[PDB]
Structures are given as structure tokens and as C-alpha cells.
Amino acid sequence: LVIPPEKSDRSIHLACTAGIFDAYVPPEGDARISTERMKKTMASQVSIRRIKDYDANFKIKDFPEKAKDIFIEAHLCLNNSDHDRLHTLVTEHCFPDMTWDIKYKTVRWSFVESLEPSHVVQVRCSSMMNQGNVYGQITVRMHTRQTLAIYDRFGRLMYGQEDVPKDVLEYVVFEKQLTNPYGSWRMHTKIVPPWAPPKQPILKTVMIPGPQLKPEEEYEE
Amino acid sequence: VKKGFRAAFRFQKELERQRLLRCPPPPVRRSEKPNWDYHAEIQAFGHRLQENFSLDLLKTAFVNSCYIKSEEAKRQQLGIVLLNLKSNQELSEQGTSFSQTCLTQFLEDEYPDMPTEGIKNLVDFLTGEEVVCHVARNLAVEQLTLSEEFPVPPAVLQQTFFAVIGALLQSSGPERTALFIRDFLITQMTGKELFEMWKIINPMGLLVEELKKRNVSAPESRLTRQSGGTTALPLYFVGLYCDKKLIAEGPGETVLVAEEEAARVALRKLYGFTENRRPWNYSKPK
Amino acid sequence: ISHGRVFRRMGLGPESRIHLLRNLLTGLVRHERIEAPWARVDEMRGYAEKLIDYGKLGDTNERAMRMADFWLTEKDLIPKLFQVLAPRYKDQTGGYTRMLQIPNRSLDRAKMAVIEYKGNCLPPLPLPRRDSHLTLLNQLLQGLRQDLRQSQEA
Amino acid sequence: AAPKNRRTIEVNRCRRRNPQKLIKVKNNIDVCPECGHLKQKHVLCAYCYEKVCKETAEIRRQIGKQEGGPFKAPTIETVVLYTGETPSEQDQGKRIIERDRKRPSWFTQN
Amino acid sequence: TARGTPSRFLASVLHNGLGRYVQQLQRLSFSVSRDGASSRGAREFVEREVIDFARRNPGVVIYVNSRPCCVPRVVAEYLNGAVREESIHCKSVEEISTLVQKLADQSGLDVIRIRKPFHTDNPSIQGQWHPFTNKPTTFRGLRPREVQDP
Amino acid sequence: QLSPTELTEMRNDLFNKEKARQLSLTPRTEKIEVKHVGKTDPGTVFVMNKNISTPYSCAMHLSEWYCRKSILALVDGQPWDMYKPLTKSCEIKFLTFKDCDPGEVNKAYWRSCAMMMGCVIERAFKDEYMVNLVRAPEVPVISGAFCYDVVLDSKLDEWMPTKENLRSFTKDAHALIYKDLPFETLEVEAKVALEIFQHSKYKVDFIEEKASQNPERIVKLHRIGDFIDVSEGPLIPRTSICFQYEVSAVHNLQPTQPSLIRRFQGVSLPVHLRAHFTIWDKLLERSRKMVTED
Amino acid sequence: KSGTWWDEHLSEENVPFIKQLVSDEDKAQLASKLCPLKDEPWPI
Amino acid sequence: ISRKWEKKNKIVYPPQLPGEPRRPAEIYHCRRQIKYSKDKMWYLAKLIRGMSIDQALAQLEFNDKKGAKIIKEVLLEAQDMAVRDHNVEFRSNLYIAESTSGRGQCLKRIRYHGRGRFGIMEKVYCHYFVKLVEGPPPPPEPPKTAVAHAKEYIQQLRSRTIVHTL
Ligand SMILES: [Mg+2]
Ligand SMILES: [Mg+2]
Numbered sequence A: 001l002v003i004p005p006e007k008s009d010r011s012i013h014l015a016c017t018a019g020i021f022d023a024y025v026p027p028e029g030d031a032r033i034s035t036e037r038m039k040k041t042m043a044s045q046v047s048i049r050r051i052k053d054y055d056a057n058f059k060i061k062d063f064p065e066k067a068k069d070i071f072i073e074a075h076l077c078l079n080n081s082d083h084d085r086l087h088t089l090v091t092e093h094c095f096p097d098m099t100w101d102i103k104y105k106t107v108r109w110s111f112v113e114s115l116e117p118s119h120v121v122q123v124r125c126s127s128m129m130n131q132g133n134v135y136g137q138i139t140v141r142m143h144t145r146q147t148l149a150i151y152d153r154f155g156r157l158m159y160g161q162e163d164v165p166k167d168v169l170e171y172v173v174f175e176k177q178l179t180n181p182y183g184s185w186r187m188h189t190k191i192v193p194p195w196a197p198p199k200q201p202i203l204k205t206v207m208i209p210g211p212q213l214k215p216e217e218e219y220e221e
Numbered sequence B: 001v002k003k004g005f006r007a008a009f010r011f012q013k014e015l016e017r018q019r020l021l022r023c024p025p026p027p028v029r030r031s032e033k034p035n036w037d038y039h040a041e042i043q044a045f046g047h048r049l050q051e052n053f054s055l056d057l058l059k060t061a062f063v064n065s066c067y068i069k070s071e072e073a074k075r076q077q078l079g080i081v082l083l084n085l086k087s088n089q090e091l092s093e094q095g096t097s098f099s100q101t102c103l104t105q106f107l108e109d110e111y112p113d114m115p116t117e118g119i120k121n122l123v124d125f126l127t128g129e130e131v132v133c134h135v136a137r138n139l140a141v142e143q144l145t146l147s148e149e150f151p152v153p154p155a156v157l158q159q160t161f162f163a164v165i166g167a168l169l170q171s172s173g174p175e176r177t178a179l180f181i182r183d184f185l186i187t188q189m190t191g192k193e194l195f196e197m198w199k200i201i202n203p204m205g206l207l208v209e210e211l212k213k214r215n216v217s218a219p220e221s222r223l224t225r226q227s228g229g230t231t232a233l234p235l236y237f238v239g240l241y242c243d244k245k246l247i248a249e250g251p252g253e254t255v256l257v258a259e260e261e262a263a264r265v266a267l268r269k270l271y272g273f274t275e276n277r278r279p280w281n282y283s284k285p286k
Numbered sequence C: 001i002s003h004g005r006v007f008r009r010m011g012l013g014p015e016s017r018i019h020l021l022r023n024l025l026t027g028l029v030r031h032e033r034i035e036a037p038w039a040r041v042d043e044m045r046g047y048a049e050k051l052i053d054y055g056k057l058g059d060t061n062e063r064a065m066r067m068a069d070f071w072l073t074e075k076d077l078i079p080k081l082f083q084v085l086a087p088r089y090k091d092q093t094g095g096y097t098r099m100l101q102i103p104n105r106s107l108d109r110a111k112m113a114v115i116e117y118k119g120n121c122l123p124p125l126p127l128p129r130r131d132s133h134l135t136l137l138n139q140l141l142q143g144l145r146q147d148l149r150q151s152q153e154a
Numbered sequence D: 001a002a003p004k005n006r007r008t009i010e011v012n013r014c015r016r017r018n019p020q021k022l023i024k025v026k027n028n029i030d031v032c033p034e035c036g037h038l039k040q041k042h043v044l045c046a047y048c049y050e051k052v053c054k055e056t057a058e059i060r061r062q063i064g065k066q067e068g069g070p071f072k073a074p075t076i077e078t079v080v081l082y083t084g085e086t087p088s089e090q091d092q093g094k095r096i097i098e099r100d101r102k103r104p105s106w107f108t109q110n
Numbered sequence E: 001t002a003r004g005t006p007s008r009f010l011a012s013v014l015h016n017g018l019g020r021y022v023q024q025l026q027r028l029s030f031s032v033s034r035d036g037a038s039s040r041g042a043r044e045f046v047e048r049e050v051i052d053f054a055r056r057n058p059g060v061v062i063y064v065n066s067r068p069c070c071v072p073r074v075v076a077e078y079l080n081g082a083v084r085e086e087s088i089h090c091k092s093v094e095e096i097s098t099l100v101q102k103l104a105d106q107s108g109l110d111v112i113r114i115r116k117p118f119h120t121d122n123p124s125i126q127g128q129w130h131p132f133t134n135k136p137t138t139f140r141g142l143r144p145r146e147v148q149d150p
Numbered sequence F: 001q002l003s004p005t006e007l008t009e010m011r012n013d014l015f016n017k018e019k020a021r022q023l024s025l026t027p028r029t030e031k032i033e034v035k036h037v038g039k040t041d042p043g044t045v046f047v048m049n050k051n052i053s054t055p056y057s058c059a060m061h062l063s064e065w066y067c068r069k070s071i072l073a074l075v076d077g078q079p080w081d082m083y084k085p086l087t088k089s090c091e092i093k094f095l096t097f098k099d100c101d102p103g104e105v106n107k108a109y110w111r112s113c114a115m116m117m118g119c120v121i122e123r124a125f126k127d128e129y130m131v132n133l134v135r136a137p138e139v140p141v142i143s144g145a146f147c148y149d150v151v152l153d154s155k156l157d158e159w160m161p162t163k164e165n166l167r168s169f170t171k172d173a174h175a176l177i178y179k180d181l182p183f184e185t186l187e188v189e190a191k192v193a194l195e196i197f198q199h200s201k202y203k204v205d206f207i208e209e210k211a212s213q214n215p216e217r218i219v220k221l222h223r224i225g226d227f228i229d230v231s232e233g234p235l236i237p238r239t240s241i242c243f244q245y246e247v248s249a250v251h252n253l254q255p256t257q258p259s260l261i262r263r264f265q266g267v268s269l270p271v272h273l274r275a276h277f278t279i280w281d282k283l284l285e286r287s288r289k290m291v292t293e294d
Numbered sequence G: 001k002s003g004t005w006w007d008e009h010l011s012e013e014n015v016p017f018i019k020q021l022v023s024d025e026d027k028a029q030l031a032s033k034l035c036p037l038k039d040e041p042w043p044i
Numbered sequence H: 001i002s003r004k005w006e007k008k009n010k011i012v013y014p015p016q017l018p019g020e021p022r023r024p025a026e027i028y029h030c031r032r033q034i035k036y037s038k039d040k041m042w043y044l045a046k047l048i049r050g051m052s053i054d055q056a057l058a059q060l061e062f063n064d065k066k067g068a069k070i071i072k073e074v075l076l077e078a079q080d081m082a083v084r085d086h087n088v089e090f091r092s093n094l095y096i097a098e099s100t101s102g103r104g105q106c107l108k109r110i111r112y113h114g115r116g117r118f119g120i121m122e123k124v125y126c127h128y129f130v131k132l133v134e135g136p137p138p139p140p141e142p143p144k145t146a147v148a149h150a151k152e153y154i155q156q157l158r159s160r161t162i163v164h165t166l
């Protein structure tokens, strides 16, 4: 399935990329705060210009407000499994990650408050005409209180709690197809910092099986 | 593939009956179903019962507090006063009080020998949820009842039934309402045994006290009949004798059971609730 | 009726039975441990025990040499019988072999047994071991034994 | 002799589902202490027996290499010696079959 | 057949007729096509018969619904909750009148085998027979061949 | 003072209250990593819930065989009840009656059989007579019987149980086995235990000795049904483990002048090691002889 | 629920001891009955 | 052909209320087109009904029939699937709620007889269905005791009416 038939004039039309052009590493201890600065900013300004080229009426200041709306509405689709609307709000790279593991699960998610205003940390653009397509990725920082309760196929609480809000610091990356006349801004992926605190523990106990040894084999620590 | 449409259509109808039978749909209020006109249904209700109800009072009797509080919540949810709807609480209290006093008068006149405890238990059975709900459901009260929850809770249905009695009392007066209570609640005693409605314990203890009140000697238990004493299916007839005179006799599978049954038989005779007592007179009052 | 019939009916008849058993015994002498159907191993086990007794007579006993010549189809094993196997059991009067049931054969679900000459150089079979003397039951019986011995000496 | 009438499913179910025809539950299954795999009380553990056979086969292949032909059985006893071991005083005069592995723990040197 | 069908005992709804008689028919729902030929007899019943039938039965709410239909039907509902649907396809006006009157007179209980052609809650006034009813008593209740005062 | 029925209700409430308190200390669902160090299933790691998950829950992750055969747990080299919640990341091994050295399992089974005897003795005598539980002496298994020291009422100072009476105690023990009650454990501070057993002088003295031995003065409490007692060590999971159980003899200990302590004795075997009728009878005879703890 | 037999759980040391113990009791019981007339016989 | 058994693991129940009892997990697994008789397979499926997952695996491991290995293979993947995809905490906490065999699609072949006569031979295939329910295996029914018989007999005596009269 990796490649369609050979020697075909028609090709697959991709609307998204698979990865981040230049991954934004957040400064350590960013959660605590809750020369190089200029160099990164200059790269963002250059990339912003090619974003305003194809779309003249673009405002960086308005995006963090728009990004929050896209984010909240995308996660609300998970609650009612509104996949048709979700494809408009997220890219094809993000859609499998969001929905694959919850196909036979009930997700109750809600947005409570935004602790800190969203800040466009980085703006970057793809190499021109990868295949005739140019993409623009805007990384945004979100510090908000959310509530998540996931239930299993049998309606039994599997993760989280349905009423307790907890703080979430996550840098959501968005992506648009500038060349496409109908392209829009769509949640593309999430940056997970290495220093990010560990997630809350699951409810059930787990067993990690040891090596299954054939008779000839012997167990070595 | 065979030509035609009729056979296919007929089979579709059967496939839909089986589908419904496999998954019976959740029941809904009759008002929600087609062919319903509330005003027409209210008027027919009175006419069936041959009662000249006041349509204003009768409609209020069906309105319950739960339906009013929920109706207001829906209004708030839709961001929509005109809902000054009076509940049936006042009518319910009036009807409940009248029914208890009226039933107490009917039963005191008919059985003058029953103590107040016995008559109270009979009134509690006749006005209890089980009896009242049965009568209400079979008189279309549940269909006309405006409630928050369906099926109507038994307590709500009982309250509505007595509200209708309250409406009748205001509309037609006590005499006409007394006939209604006679014809729909007193009739519920038909076939019932005394101690099937009045649940008592230690009948022998109650019997001894009653005979003391009557200045009669304590009853002596004696074995009148016996069969199969040593078998797994004995028959015993125990007779209760007062001054060596047989007041009652009861059968049983054991002497203890037979003796207890004999005490119940003696109580039924003392209170006038014998199986062969004069039936209740439902004839038009002269 | 088969009262007191001590031999099994296998193979194609009496001669074939001996030949079948002889091939099993020849394999056992060479390899010192073989697996075969349980009934056939049980039948051959008696012959494998007696072969050692003939080996103990020595290679100079002409009767023993004729017996070994018949039963060992591979002649290099006859020196092994007289000079390796029989000397190993010089200090025993019997019990030269051990027979244990193994799981049923995969193809035909035949009941199977492993047989070996004791004292071989091969990896030891997972022999069935009795419960430790330290178990609850064995300790209660040790106490009972101790007590009885003390009462007898008195 | 042919069946004079068809046998009903009611009759057949009685014959087929009779307790005699059913599979009997086994009460002699126990866990093997050495490996933890299930075994029957009177039968050697399959897992342990297979492990022993695998080592036996390896040793037998080594014996073949030393013999190097048919009808070459030795006239002396044999001792299997694993890596890092040398013949003992009691192993003198015995053909030494060397195995290129560490001595198995269950295999005890004698 | 009786063994192949359910049965019930003769009964009434809320002891009907004991204190007063209450008509059990509570609602009638007609579905008469405007143009269907099968509904011709049902249309004539709605023009002259249904109005006079409603005057006589004020406790029955009749719902006449004119809509396209190939099979006109009348649905009868009773106070006990029973629902009965009877087709009036190609029936004459007189036939429909008879059917509608029959529905008015029925209690709504299942039209199935009735075990007994009568019912009573008080079958006995003098005491139900038992094996000792007609037996004489004996002095000191002595049993057959029983030695007293031994 | 409190009636016998009320005394149990008081002690159970205190026991339950302390159990609830320790459960609250647990923060949400913290996770511990328990590594399996047994010979079989080597290398299995259990990610369990601190202060809730017990060794039995780890056996349930493996197979039913572990649950049925595992009588005691070895947690970081220390014997651990199967139903005692695990408190830290540790190594775990499972012990059976048929291990090469089942000494610890024998002691655990041995101590539990004595605790079941205490339960029946306390609930056997008529309410008239007073039964005062003293202690369960730690006697080696080779002694042939487990023993439990009791003090009876002064009225029963010349009474010795009859054979039918001894059989009555046995029938009560077998009823406890039939009930299949778990051995619930609680490690509480001396103060909590002293409140539970305030009415009994012997338990207070016994409780004090155990607290003194340990620096943190935590005492081990066990409960089966409505009977609570103080123990010397880990117990078996359930009473259904016992198959052969008989109260064999009651001896009067000497000196009798201060108080007449009656040593009740019994012998039992688990389902895993049940003995033949003939062999069992021989064990009953030796069990009836007096044992002198050394 | 698994079946057991008398020496299933007995150790190597205890099997000979148990055999000797039960064997001696059988012999002693048989020897104790060799004098019926000295042990309260029934009327002859 | 029908394949409804595979669609029963796709039913999502709604979230349970706080006071409702925890619903047991149900895992449906099957193997299709096994070269083996359904009649012979029925006996093995019958054996393990009501058994715990571990007891069923033990009984099948030491059975001599070919179907035993196939069922054991299916049971093991069902047990793995129960923990991996169905939020079953303990893999041992499973029991056989349902186990049955079905007829598969079979093939017809000729079997030759003497005198030029023939028969039609069916190459038989079957299906195996299993349902695993989370929890301890349900206890067996106690044999109806004498007390129960006497109580039932007396109950029938007491329900006995005078027939064909008032
Ligand atoms: Mg043959
Ligand atoms: Mg031919």
C-alpha cells in the first residue's frame, strides 16, 4: 500500500506534512515562569512574511485567540465523535493520534479556564515548492485548566476524574497550506518537553511479562 | 427474483413486528402519541364516570408540583409570567381527608363491632398506594395526569386520584362524592378476607383481650379432629371453648397453626367479618 | 483368556517381536538413553537387564558371547557391553535401568517412555523427587518417630 | 440390515450427550516446581524433558564428531566437560566430550 | 385449539357494574381515505352515523383522520389499556355500524378461551366441604381401637 | 463493663476505624514497582497500587495456580501476608507448603491454627462463665500440636472437658473453616492496639511486650470474621486452607496457685498436605500429649 | 480436590518408618486376640 | 456466511453511574474454517463451559484430541486480547461464559467404491466460538436436597384447587 501503481500521471495530493520543520524546544523551567532571542525572532519574521504573502490579511496578534478556539473545538469533537467536523479542525497527521486509541472508548473532556494568555512562540515555513506546496507552521504555547475523564468500552472509569481540573502546559503546533486556495489553519501536532512532569497514574494495575524462554534457553538477569 | 410488490410489502410488515418484539420500544405517555386532544379527554373522563365535574377544578387536579417545577426549568433553559399554574396540592388534601372520614363512616356503620384499630387499617388499605393506583390506572387517571416522570410514580398517581375526589367534592358536594367512594374504593373489598387486608400478629393475644373487654372467660384450646398425626401431612382441627362452649374452630397442618387459625376465625365472628356476612348494599339510597 | 501370559503380542509375530525388541536394545546400548512407545520399552526392559548379567559373566564365557552376538546387531557394541557397561554395574545385583513415562507422542498420541542405563554421561532426566523432610506433614511424623524411639530406649 | 426408520435428533442427542461420551475432567494436573509449566503427576514435565533432550542432542552430535564414522563405539567411559573446566582425577582414562557452553545449572558435575 | 392457545378466567374491570356501570371503551381512531374505493363505506359512516354515535357515547373520544390509505382501520382503546385494531376495508356502512357498536360493548379483556362461564369470590355460604363435614364426633375424641386411661 | 456481644462491636469499630484512616493516607493511586524474584516466571514486574495492592493481587496477574498454591509471600526477604497491602517498590517471592524449606510457611500456618482455636474457645462457653484469652505460645511444629493458653472462670476450676466437649470444639473449628474467612491484617501503633484490648489484662501486657521489641512500637493485629487477636507473625490467607483440624486435649498448667491457665491443644493439616486416615490418627494421639515450649 | 494416596506427600525418610509402624501395630493387634477364653468369652 | 460474533466486541456501553455495580467485561473471540468436525469439536467446547481461564487451559493442554490445541490457541489470544484491548486488570480473572462449535463451509469429494459405484465425501470444516466474562467462575448448582423436594411436593399439594366447579 506504500505506493500506488507505477507510471501513473495522477499522484496522491497531500494536504499536510508528517513532522515539524524546525522543532521548537521550550526553555527549561518555562512552567516555573508561568542575541539568540533576536536570531530566532528574525527567522520568525522572515517566515511570517511568506505567510502574509499568500494571505495578505493575516495578523499574528489574532492567531493565539484563533488557536485556542481551534483547540477547544477540536477536543470537543472527541466527546461526541464528530469526525467530519474534526477533519476541518486538525490535519491528517494529527487525526489518527487523536482518535485511534479512543475508537471504543468514551472521552469526557472540558475546558475550564486559560491561566495565561497564549503566546506565538515560533512561526516557520517550509522550503519553497517541496512538491509545489508551501506550508506554514505556527507553534503556540497554552497554559490552561482542563478536565478529562476517559471510560472504557463498558462505561467504567479508566483514566482521570470528571470534575477535578488540573493544569496543562502544552505547546500546540498548527499548520496551514498557503498554496491551497481553501487551506486553513489546523492543529498539526504537540511538543512534549523532556522536562514535562509525568502524567497522572492510571487506575488499574499492570504486569510487564518477563522473557518467555524456550527450554534450551536460560534466564540471565 | 419473483415479480410483484404485495408479498414483499406483507413480509416487510412482519419483519417490523419481529424487530419491535425483539427490542420493545420504551413506553411513552399517551399524550405524546397521535390522536390526543387533552380538552376532549378531560370532558370524556367526567362523562364516563357520570359526574358533573367543573372543568376548571378537574384540570387543576391533574397538575402536579413536579410537572410545574420541571416546566419552569425547561422555560429557563430556552430563555423564554404565563405559567401561574395552580398545583393539585390543595385539592389533594381535601380529597384525602374526605375519603378517610367518608370511608370511616361507611365502615363504622356496616361493622359496628370492629375496634378503631381494625377500621383504621381497612381505611389505610383502601386508600393505600396499591389499591388507589390500581383504580386510578383503570380509570384513565394516569393518561390525564401531568407529571414530570413517566411512568407516573405511584405516590404521584395516588395524590392525583385524591385530587380528583377533591374536585368532585367542590363540584357536586359530599353526598355525590360519597357514592363515588362507595363505587370505586369500597368495591375493592370484594372477596378480600379481614386479615388479608388488616395484617395482624398474635391473633390469640388480641382475642384474649377482646373477650376480657366482653367479660367472657378466656378461651380453652381443644383438639376437635385429627388425621395423620404421625405422618408428613397431618390435619388438625383446634376448637376454642369459652365456658365449655365452642366459639370458633380452625384447621391446620399443626396444632399450633390450627390454634392460631381458630383464633382468627373467632376474631372474624366477633368483628362481623365472616365470609358469609350480609354483602355490602350498593342499591340506590332511598 | 490370557491368564498368566507374561509376554506381549507385537510386531508381525514371535520372530518379529524379538527383532523389534533387539533393535531397541541395540539402540539403548549405543546411546544409553532412548525413547519409544511405553509398552515396547516395558517389554524390552527385562531383556536390557538380563543382557548386563550375561556381560558380567565375561567375554571369555562362550555362551555369553553368543548371547551378546545375537542381541547386539552392531558388533562394536559387544566390546562396550563386556568392558564398559558390565564393569560399571560390578557392585550392583540389579536395577541397571530406569524407565519413566514421558508425554504422549505428538503424531499418534502413543503412550511414551524414556529408558536409560543408570550411570550414563548424559544430562540427567528430571527425575520425580519426593517431598522434602521439612514439610509440615514430614515434620509432624519426625516428631512422632523421635517420641517412639525415646519411649523404647527407656 | 438397514435402518428401518430415521433416528430423531432427540434420540441422537441422548446418545451423543450421554455422560459416558463426554470428556472427563483430569484431577492429576500440577505445576512443575522447576519451570512452572503444567505437568501430570505421573508424567515427566514436557518443558524440562525437552530442555534435557536439547542438551543431550548437542552432546550426541559432539560424540559423533569424535567418533568420526560408524561402528566406532569407545571401550572406555565418557565425561562431558564444559567451558572453563578440566578433567578431574576420576575423569582420567575417559573420553572427554567438550561442549562450547557454560555448564547448565541443572546439569551437575560428577 | 385450547391447548394451543392461552386462556383466562371470567372477570371484570374494577368490579364493573357492582356499584355503577362504566363503559370501558375510551377512544376510537378512524382512518378514512378521501378517495380510496375501499374507504367508500367508511366515508358514508362518517357523514351520517359517526355524529349520532358520538351523541350516545359522550365518554368515548372519537378521532376521525382523513388521509391517504389503502386499508381504512378503526383502533379501539379501553380503560384497562387494551388496544384493538379492526380493519374496515370495503365494509358497508351497516357493517361498520355493527362493528363499532360491538367495540363499544366489550370490556377490553382478551378475547381468548374463558375457562368457566361464571365467576364468584364467595362460592360457599354454609362452609366448604371437608372430610369431617359429615362425620360424627366421638366421646373424648377417641380414635378407632384406642385404649383410654391405661 | 461491656457485654460480650458489645465488646466485639466496640473492637470491630475501632479496628475498622483504624483501617479506614490508614487508607486515607494513601495519595490517590500512587504506583509501586514489584519485581518477581522467583525461580519461575523470572523477570516479571508488577506495577501495583501503593497501600492497596497485596501479594495476592500480584499472583492474580500471573495465574490461578499462584493464587491457590501461594500461602505466604517473601517481600524483600521478609515473610509477608498474601493480603497485606504492599507499601513500597520491592522484590517479591511466593512460598508454598511444598517448597524445599517451607519453615516460614509452616510457622504461618502453625500460628493461624492457634488463632482459630482462640476464636472457638472464646465463643464456646456459656455467658455465665468468663473466658480470658492469654496468648498463643510459639511452639515448634515438631512438638506435634499447637497450643493456646487460656484462663477460665473460677467456677470452672474443677471442670475438665469431656471427649464430647472436645469434639464440640472441633465442630466449631470446622464451621470456621467452612465459612472460608480471610485473615485480615492490620499493623497499628501500640496506642491503637491498647485501646482495642483495654478490657483484657493479658493482651495489654502482651501488646506492651511486642511494642517494646520494635523501635516504632507498631503491633500486628489480625481479624477473622468478628474475632480480633494479636499475632507473632504473618498468617495464611484464608481459613479454608485447613482441611484436617481437631482440638485434641486441654491441659492444666502448673503452678496453679496464681491462676489456673488451661492449655488448649490441637493439630491440623492443610488441604495440600492432607494425611491418610490411619496416619492422621497417629498424629492425633501425639497431639494429645502436653507440649512444653522451650 | 485432587486425589491423594497414603505416601504421596511422605519424604524418603518417612516412608520406611510409616511402613514399619503400621506393620507392627497389625501384628500386635493380632497377637492380642490369641487368648479368647481369658477375655470374657460368651457362654459356651 | 454470517460474521456477527466479531461485531460483539465493538459495542460501546455508556458511562456507568457512580452507584451502579461495576459491569463485567465481555470478550467475544472465534476461529473460522477449522479443518475439524463440529461434532467432535462440540465435546471439547462442552468440557470448558463454566471453567476459569486457567482451568480450561490446563484441561486442554493434556487432551489428546486435535481440537484441544486449536481451542487452547484461541483461548490464549482471547486472554491476551482481554487485558490489552478490553481493560481487564487480571488475566487470570476470566471464565468461559460461552463455548460452542459451528458448522463451516465444507467441500465435496468423490469416494470410490467397488463395482463402479461411488459415494460423496464431505471435507468437514467448523467454527469455534468463545465468550470470556471477567470475574470468578460462577459456582456450580448444589444438588437438589430432600428438603427441597419435600417443600416442592407440599407446594403442589397446596396449589391444588377443586376443579370443574364453582
Ligand atoms: Mg499389531
Ligand atoms: Mg473399474
Ligand SMILES: [Zn+2]
Residues within 6 Å of the ligand: D032, D033, D034, D035, D036, D037, D045, D046, D047, D048, D049
Ligand atoms: Zn518443568
